[PDB]
Amino acid sequence: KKISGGSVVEMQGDEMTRIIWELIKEKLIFPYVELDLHSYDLGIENRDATNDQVTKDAAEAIKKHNVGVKCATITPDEKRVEEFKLKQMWKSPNGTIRNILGGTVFREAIICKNIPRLVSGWVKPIIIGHHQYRATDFVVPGPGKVEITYTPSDGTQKVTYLVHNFEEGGGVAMGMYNQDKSIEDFAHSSFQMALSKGWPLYLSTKNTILKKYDGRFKDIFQEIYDKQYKSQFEAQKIWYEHRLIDDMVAQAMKSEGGFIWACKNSLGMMTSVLVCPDGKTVEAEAAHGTVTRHYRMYQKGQETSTNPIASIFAWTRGLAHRAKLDNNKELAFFANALEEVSIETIEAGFMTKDLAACIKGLPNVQRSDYLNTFEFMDKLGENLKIKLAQAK
Amino acid sequence: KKISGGSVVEMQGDEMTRIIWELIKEKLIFPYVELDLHSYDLGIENRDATNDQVTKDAAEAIKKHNVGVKCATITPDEKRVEEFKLKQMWKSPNGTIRNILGGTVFREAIICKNIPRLVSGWVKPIIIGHHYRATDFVVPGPGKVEITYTPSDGTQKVTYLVHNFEEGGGVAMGMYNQDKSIEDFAHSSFQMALSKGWPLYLSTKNTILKKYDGRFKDIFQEIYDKQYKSQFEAQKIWYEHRLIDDMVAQAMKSEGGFIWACKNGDVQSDSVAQGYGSLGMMTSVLVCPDGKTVEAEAAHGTVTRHYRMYQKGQETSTNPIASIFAWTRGLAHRAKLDNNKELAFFANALEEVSIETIEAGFMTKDLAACIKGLPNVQRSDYLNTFEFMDKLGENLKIKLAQAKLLE
Ligand SMILES: NC(=O)c1ccc[n+]([C@@H]2O[C@H](COP(=O)([O-])OP(=O)(O)OC[C@H]3O[C@@H](n4cnc5c(N)ncnc54)[C@H](OP(=O)(O)O)[C@@H]3O)[C@@H](O)[C@H]2O)c1
Ligand SMILES: NC(=O)c1ccc[n+]([C@@H]2O[C@H](COP(=O)([O-])OP(=O)(O)OC[C@H]3O[C@@H](n4cnc5c(N)ncnc54)[C@H](OP(=O)(O)O)[C@@H]3O)[C@@H](O)[C@H]2O)c1
Ligand SMILES: N#Cc1ccnc(N2C(=O)CC[C@H]2C(=O)N(c2cncc(F)c2)[C@H](C(=O)NC2CC(F)(F)C2)c2ccccc2Cl)c1
């Protein structure tokens, strides 16, 4: 009798990540959880064959089922169009899914204490959140004034601001905007993420330079905090504070981690989760590529050692949310247990070649210092079997 | 006999940096180089007594003599206005000098093998450059925001819709860039790449901002193909445009040794500036588009905290590296302008002595803290401000004796 997992939208991907993704399901997920699985093949050949229809259907399935877990995919370039003889240079599946779903992206680096970090003092993870893409830019052919005007719907408080009077020559100009609703959705997603993980939240802004534009972000976060989150933040002993981007960077340099950083906006050790405005829909993926170099080694029968942590944490993050929506304690436990096993295995000295190279330096790595992809996956599977057995 | 260094504009500054600036001149520069020195005292008291006229004169002297070396100065605020009983809250000397000369600021680290950096694989520094002007306002309620271009030659006005706020309000802004500022940014970046002998990359988001960022990519490309391609090829270096996301990822896997000209989006640019263990290991060079005018300084402040201890007679341990490198990078540019081989060698030797002294285990407290962690540093792990300067002086004497073997 396995854990009833419920409805999960799964997206298969490309190259080396496609193989590790199958290994994750076969050795870590399917032996313990049964799912009403909505599988979508986002491999480049299948996106080409279906005229990218499979991507739009996967995005539609995440809207309906609320939980998506996605494998890394190829975003075609000129070189990829010739390799697969593609009909078109298809847009990024991540971009297509992101535009259909909307929300805030939270990036979380997975911390293993024996694996070096950018800043050595980082002991707890840092979560970066961000909601520009709709700016109106143009070329200014020569001298003349560029003005930006606001005309209210009634007509009454109309204002015209001089952006610049070009005099010596031309250049470029652009108008940018941010709707209140977008700032409020980002603020709510950030406060909720901070309470879910139990860490303080910091919003970074440049309000000393953009007093009006960034000033509105700061005020909206401060108002939303004082109105509906400070009582829950005080209860869990966490806080919200604004920081100037230059100040925030210096504070992160002297920090030990353990916070959410909201911005106005080893590689296999980071996840990206899209949290939709409805507070119910989530899409989790590994924040890395398809590992082409390792895939070429695999195609030549050579032994590979590819870090699967980010892809495992896409599964655990998705299953953790699926368990929270359904109130499934068994699933919530399984998701947390797989994350613990993944970190415990690496911290105990069992890791892939790339992690061993971070520690020793590539020229110093011996075969005995690491496990190949299959050996690491089997080591995790043995530790997971033990962790789950000692729970029942 | 001393080297004849030629014309240098020097600007004296404030607090701790003023103290070590004098030790550098006394112990490292003056015993070896004779200069036609144009010195301007940018001390806070002198700027107040001259009504900031010294700052404007220093900037005009840099324009005339092409080489400026600046000590850190106090940018006044309310506490400074009280402390010094200032007449006005004088503007930043760097802001006044930058406005007069123009140019792009390049920040470069000083690498030491035994001193940790953001990315361990970095062996050569990464030089990042940046060449307010934005018009932002709140949109209080529903309505239309439009941006308009009215040609001064009387031709038809062009209007672009920014956004129809159908419900509620928000914020909006207008930004601009002149073609001449973009051209100046490209010239300075190409000239900096050629001076250092490293490849140059321009990072934009031209995929999203097709006309705004595309103008940067296109101007850089056209200036490269017309007046820098052969000079770059002749040094085994090149210019390449890169999307900001590709660029931040290449810099994370590279060993350093490249110029990164970024149009901006400076979260990553700040992490590189503050990612070499200490503020004492970073220099900030203003490079003018003429390829002749330069102004170098430490990319840090006057070190007020250390200065208060100095006033009390307490021992201090202030890092002079960035201040030494403002002098050496200034002297290196002076040497290249005059084809002074003797001066070019001296500036090179002084940089190598500084790096070697630290690499041999002799350093200030901030560098010892980078190695052992601040709680674990003990007095015996470092040298005080004077001891380190005396050790650099001793080592410089030894290096110059070894160099006489070339002749
Ligand atoms: N998330 C996405 O769907 C996404 C985002 C961007 C790009 N892409 C696509 O990915 C394709 C291929 O990108 P890429 O080959 O540069 O892949 P990548 O995953 O970004 O990795 C580049 C290199 O870094 C190392 N590495 C990265 N992740 C690793 C991991 N998990 N475990 C071990 N080593 C890892 C490997 O080198 P070593 O052997 O030296 O360790 C690898 O060759 C592109 O065509 C692009 O369109 C996908
Ligand atoms: N370019 C310029 O002229 C410039 C730029 C910035 C600031 N300033 C001015 O400098 C004054 C003081 O500013 P600030 O204290 O905020 O910044 P700062 O002088 O850069 O000092 C901040 C801290 O950084 C460390 N530090 C910086 N340079 C160091 C060095 N050479 N050796 C050792 N440690 C060093 C010290 O850390 P610990 O305290 O931990 O020892 C120091 O207290 C202000 O009046 C400001 O306006 C001038
Ligand atoms: N807006 C915004 C915003 C805010 C914060 N982080 C980002 N980021 C990205 O866009 C991806 C990487 C990441 C980032 O810039 N960094 C970072 C990374 N991990 C964890 C953090 F808390 C930050 C920096 C970083 O990676 N610097 C290196 C890349 C480089 F610029 F070449 C040097 C970095 C490194 C070390 C100390 C502080 C900093 Cl901010 C964007």
Residue B223 Cα to ligand 2 midpoint, Å, equals 38
Alpha-carbon distance B388 to B370, whole Å?
17
User: Whose structure tokens read 């201040």?
Assistant: B323
Q: How many CB atoms lie within 10 A of CB B40?
A: 24
Nearest to B43 by CA among B25, B58, B64, B26: B58
A392: buried, middle or exposed (CB in 10 Å: 19+, 13-18, 0-12)? Answer: exposed
User: Whose structure tokens read 């004779």?
Assistant: B34
Pairing of the two strands B33-41 and B67-70:
unpaired
Contact predicate A28/A244, CB 8 Å: no
Ligand index nearest the alpha carbon of residue A92 = 1
What is the least distance, in Å, from the CA of B183 to any CA of chain A? 10
Contact predicate B78/B89, CB 8 Å: yes
Handedness of CA B362, B367, B371, B372 (dihedral sign): positive
PDB resolution in Å? 2.1
Nearest to A285 by CA among A4, A13, A46, A65: A13
Nearest to B370 by CA among B272, B238, B258, B279: B279
Contact predicate A270/A97, CB 8 Å: no
Residue A254 parent element (H or E): none
B159 beta partners: B148
Residue B104 parent element (H or E): strand B104-109
Token pair recorded at residue A269 = 């050790």
Alpha-carbon distance A362 to A353, whole Å?
9
Token pair recorded at residue A311 = 């892809």
Q: How many CB atoms lie within 10 A of CB A300?
A: 7
Contact predicate B302/B18, CB 8 Å: yes
Handedness of CA B19, B24, B25, B27 (dihedral sign): positive
Token pair recorded at residue A18 = 């496609």
Alpha-carbon distance A263 to A132, whole Å?
13
Q: What's the full length of chain A, in residues?
A: 392
Nearest to A338 by CA among A32, A107, A116, A114: A32
For atom 10 of ligand 1, the residue with the nearest CA is A289
Token pair recorded at residue B276 = 């070499």
Token pair recorded at residue A134 = 């709709």
Residue B78 parent element (H or E): helix B78-84
Tell me which DSSP letter residue A115 carries.
S
Pairing of the two strands B282-287 and B200-204:
unpaired
Alpha-carbon distance B149 to B163, whole Å?
16
Contact predicate B262/B129, CB 8 Å: yes
Token pair recorded at residue B220 = 């850089």
Helix (H, G, I), strand (E, B) or coil at A158: coil
Indicate yes or no: CB of A213 within 8 angstroms of CB of B173: yes
Q: E strands, B218-369, where?
A: 239-243, 258-262, 282-287, 294-298
Query: What angle in degrees, to the nearest 10, is found between the helix axes of A15-24 and A309-326?
Result: 50
Alpha-carbon distance B292 to B68, whole Å?
11
Nearest to B175 among A119, A174, A211 (CB): A174
CA distances from A216 to A206, A289, B172 (A): 11, 36, 10
Cα B3–B8–B14 angle (5° rounding)? 115
Helix (H, G, I), strand (E, B) or coil at B46: helix
Contact predicate B320/B280, CB 8 Å: yes
Token pair recorded at residue A64 = 């309906």
Token pair recorded at residue B304 = 């007020």
End-to-end CA distance of chain A: 13
Alpha-carbon distance A78 to B331, whole Å?
47
Ligand index nearest the alpha carbon of residue A97 = 1
Residue B401 parent element (H or E): helix B385-403
User: Whose structure tokens read 């996605």?
Assistant: A70
A47-54 contacts: CB < 8 A, separation 24 or more?
Answer: A47/A73, A47/A90, A47/A93, A48/A84, A48/A86, A48/A87, A48/A90, A51/A87, A52/A90, A52/A91, A52/A93, A52/A96
Contact predicate B353/B392, CB 8 Å: yes
Q: What's the full length of chain B, in residues?
A: 407
User: Whose structure tokens read 């001298």?
Assistant: A143
Nearest to A150 by CA among B222, B13, B146, B269: B146
- Sheet of B135-139, strand order: A136-140, A171-179, B170-178, B135-139
Ligand 3 surroundings by CB, under 6 angstroms: A 118-119, 126, 128, 249, 252-253, 261, 263, 265; B 118, 248, 251-252, 267-268, 271-272
What is the least distance, in Å, from the CA of A147 to any CA of chain B? 5
DSSP codes of every residue in B190-226 = HHHHHHHT--EEEEE-TTTSTTHHHHHHHHHHHHHHH
Contact predicate A86/A76, CB 8 Å: yes
Pairing of the two strands B294-298 and B239-243:
unpaired
Helix (H, G, I), strand (E, B) or coil at A4: strand
Alpha-carbon distance B260 to B273, whole Å?
12
Tell me which DSSP letter residue B66 carries.
S
Helix (H, G, I), strand (E, B) or coil at B151: strand
End-to-end CA distance of chain B: 15
Residue A351 parent element (H or E): none
Alpha-carbon distance A46 to A87, whole Å?
12
Alpha-carbon distance B186 to B221, whole Å?
9
Going by C-beta distance under 8 Å and a sequence separation of 6 or more, which residues neighbour residue B336? B195, B344
Residue A161 dihedral angles phi and psi, to the nearest 5°: -110, 135
Residue type for position A11: M
For atom 44 of ligand 2, the residue with the nearest CA is B74
What is the least distance, in Å, from the CA of A180 to any CA of chain B? 5
| Method underlying the structure | X-ray
- The upper half-sphere exposure of residue B95, i.e. CA atoms within 13 Å in the direction of its Cβ, equals 8
Residue type for position A33: V
Question: Chain B residue closest to A220 (CA)?
Answer: B170
Contact predicate B248/B88, CB 8 Å: no
Contact predicate B267/B203, CB 8 Å: no
Tell me which DSSP letter residue A88 carries.
S
A262: buried, middle or exposed (CB in 10 Å: 19+, 13-18, 0-12)? Answer: buried
Helix (H, G, I), strand (E, B) or coil at B341: helix
Residue A214 Cα to ligand 2 midpoint, Å, equals 27
Token pair recorded at residue B133 = 């002007």
Nearest to B150 among A145, A152, A263 (CB): A145
Contact predicate B135/A144, CB 8 Å: no
User: Whose structure tokens read 């699985």?
Assistant: A37
Q: How many CB atoms lie within 10 A of CB B122?
A: 20
Alpha-carbon distance A347 to A344, whole Å?
5
Alpha-carbon distance A208 to A214, whole Å?
8
Give the domains, in start order, of chain A with CATH numbers.
Answer: 1-115+266-392 (3.40.718.10), 117-134+182-265 (no CATH), 136-175 (no CATH)
Residue A254 Cα to ligand 1 midpoint, Å, equals 30
Helix ranges (H only) for chain A are 15-24, 44-49, 53-65, 78-84, 93-101, 180-197, 213-228, 230-235, 245-253, 292-299, 309-326, 329-347, 353-360, 373-389
Going by C-beta distance under 8 Å and a sequence separation of 6 or more, which residues neighbour residue B254? B121, B122, B126
Q: How many CB atoms lie within 10 A of CB A21?
A: 25
Residue B170 Ramachandran class (φ > 0 left, ψ -120 to 50 alpha, else beta): left
Alpha-carbon distance B149 to A147, whole Å?
7
Going by C-beta distance under 8 Å and a sequence separation of 6 or more, which residues neighbour residue B374? none
Token pair recorded at residue B189 = 């970046």
Map B121-190 to HEC letters: CCCCCEEEEECCCCEEEEECCCEEEEEEEEECCCCCCEEEEEEEECCCCEEEEEEEEEHHHHHHHHHHHH
Contact predicate A245/A206, CB 8 Å: yes
Tell me which DSSP letter residue A262 carries.
E
Alpha-carbon distance B348 to A160, whole Å?
55
Alpha-carbon distance A351 to A347, whole Å?
8
Going by C-beta distance under 8 Å and a sequence separation of 6 or more, which residues neighbour residue A239? A200, A201, A233
User: Whose structure tokens read 């007093």?
Assistant: A211
